[PDB]
Amino acid sequence: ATYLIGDVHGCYDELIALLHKVEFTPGKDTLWLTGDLVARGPGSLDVLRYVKSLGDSVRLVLGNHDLHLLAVFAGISRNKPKDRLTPLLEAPDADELLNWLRRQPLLQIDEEKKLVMAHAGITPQWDLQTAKECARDVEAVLSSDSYPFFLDAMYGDMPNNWSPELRGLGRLRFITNAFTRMRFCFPNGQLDMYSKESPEEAPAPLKPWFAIPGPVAEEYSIAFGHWASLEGKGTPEGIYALDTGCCWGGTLTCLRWEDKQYFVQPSNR
Ligand SMILES: [Mn+2]
Ligand SMILES: [Mn+2]
């Protein structure tokens, strides 16, 4: 079976309880995770250990908090006490865990399921070939010995409009923001980097990225996490918002792909 789970955010107990609920069995089953494995919840260390141990039985995409953890680890960014990352950062296997984490994809595609996953979704300004090329470019910098330079360069809110003519720092920053920070778009598809509210609470003319028809969404289902204030609701057919806010006191959500059946684990917080 194929299971897809939204942002775990260190909620190790809830993740294991949910997987036991569906009798997740590596070798028979595959787990897709929308990223943001770490921060806020108490068990980022156990989450990373477990997910890495799954190997080919898990298909991960990196989220914005995963990238922030890598930035903290590399000395690029300051650790925030609220993220509860110190046990992971101080673990004897921190190097092993985080060097694995930075090699994971930003984008997962299953052609037989016609299924695409990224942390925040797929901007309507991207077709599939462009999404693939951009994911490959940023994954290459993240997997390289020089990844702290990219992590430092990734921070920024501009440019917010895609063009194949983009080059250099702006190209990487847009790619990173589209895959891991996107929520709202202007009517032309341009990213808004400030509003984090629910669609009903957002100011005009902002619309959810998935409310703007784009070539990937027209052919593929898209699963994503990230947007907790969406609460997994209000999406069109073929769009699966899996982040139901477990670390925030909401729930951890698991979708079984074969029958589109949902399983929910309440937050222990
Ligand atoms: Mn998140
Ligand atoms: Mn996120």
Domain residues of the chain, as ranges? 2-266
Residue at token pair 């959500």 = 253
Q: Are the CB atoms for 239 and 210 separated by under 8 Å? A: yes
Q: Are the CB atoms for 119 and 176 separated by under 8 Å? A: no
Technique used: X-ray
How many C-alpha atoms does 49 have within 13 Å on its Cβ side? 13
Tell me, in angstroms, the distance from the centre of ligand 2 to residue 180's CA.
6
CATH of span 2-266? 3.60.21.10
Residue 170, burial from CB neighbour count under 10 angstroms (0-12, 13-18, 19+): middle
Residue 95, burial from CB neighbour count under 10 angstroms (0-12, 13-18, 19+): exposed
Tell me, in angstroms, the distance from the centre of ligand 1 to residue 130's CA.
24
Decide the pairing of beta strands 207-208 and 115-118.
Answer: unpaired
Which residues make Cβ contacts (< 8 Å) with residue 152, sequence separation at least 6?
A: 71, 76
Tell me, in angstroms, the distance from the centre of ligand 1 to residue 7's CA.
5
Which ligand is closest in space to the CA of residue 120? 2
Task: Say what the alpha-carbon torsion angle 196, 199, 200, 201 is, to the nearest 10 degrees.
Answer: 10
Using alpha carbons, list the distances in angstroms from residue 128 to 110, 123, 216: 12, 10, 6
Tell me, in angstroms, the distance from the centre of ligand 1 to residue 246's CA.
9
Tell me, in angstroms, the distance from the centre of ligand 2 to residue 250's CA.
15
Tell me, in angstroms, the distance from the centre of ligand 2 to residue 63's CA.
5
List, in sequence order, every residue forming a beta bridge with 241; answer none if it has no partner.
224
Displacement of CA 1 from its chain's centroid (Å): 21
Rounded to whole angstroms, the Cα distance separating 199 from 204 reads 10
Rounded to whole angstroms, the Cα distance separating 47 from 71 reads 18
Rg value, the chain, Cα: 17
Of 132, 219, 217, 138, the closest CA to residue 173 belongs to: 138
Phi, psi of 63, deg, nearest 5: -110, 180
Q: Are the CB atoms for 37 and 68 separated by under 8 Å? A: no
Displacement of CA 233 from its chain's centroid (Å): 17
Decide the pairing of beta strands 221-224 and 115-118.
Answer: parallel
Rounded to whole angstroms, the Cα distance separating 180 from 121 reads 8
List, in sequence order, every residue forming a beta bridge with 4; answer none if it has no partner.
32, 255
The resolution in angstroms reads 1.8
Decide the pairing of beta strands 58-60 and 30-33.
Answer: parallel
Tell me, in angstroms, the distance from the centre of ligand 2 to residue 78's CA.
18
DSSP state of 233: -
Strand order through the sheet with 58-60 = 58-60, 30-33, 2-5, 251-256, 261-266
Phi, psi of 93, deg, nearest 5: -100, 20
Tell me, in angstroms, the distance from the centre of ligand 1 to residue 165's CA.
31
Which ligand is closest in space to the CA of residue 177? 2
Which ligand is closest in space to the CA of residue 119? 2
Tell me, in angstroms, the distance from the centre of ligand 2 to residue 53's CA.
23
Q: Hey, is 221 helix, strand or coil?
A: strand
Of 70, 21, 36, 17, the closest CA to residue 224 belongs to: 36
| DSSP character string of 22-74 | TT--BTTBEEEE-S--SSSSS-HHHHHHHHHHHGGGEEE---HHHHHHHHHHT
List, in sequence order, every residue forming a beta bridge with 115; answer none if it has no partner.
110, 221
Residue at token pair 């250990």 = 49
Tell me, in angstroms, the distance from the centre of ligand 2 to residue 164's CA.
25
Q: Hey, is 163 helix, strand or coil?
A: coil
Using alpha carbons, list the distances in angstroms from residue 27 to 55, 231, 259: 10, 31, 19
Q: Are the CB atoms for 219 and 114 separated by under 8 Å? A: yes
Strand order through the sheet with 184-185 = 191-192, 184-185, 207-208
Of 24, 226, 25, 4, the closest CA to residue 115 belongs to: 4
Which ligand is closest in space to the CA of residue 7? 1
Q: Are the CB atoms for 101 and 35 separated by under 8 Å? A: no
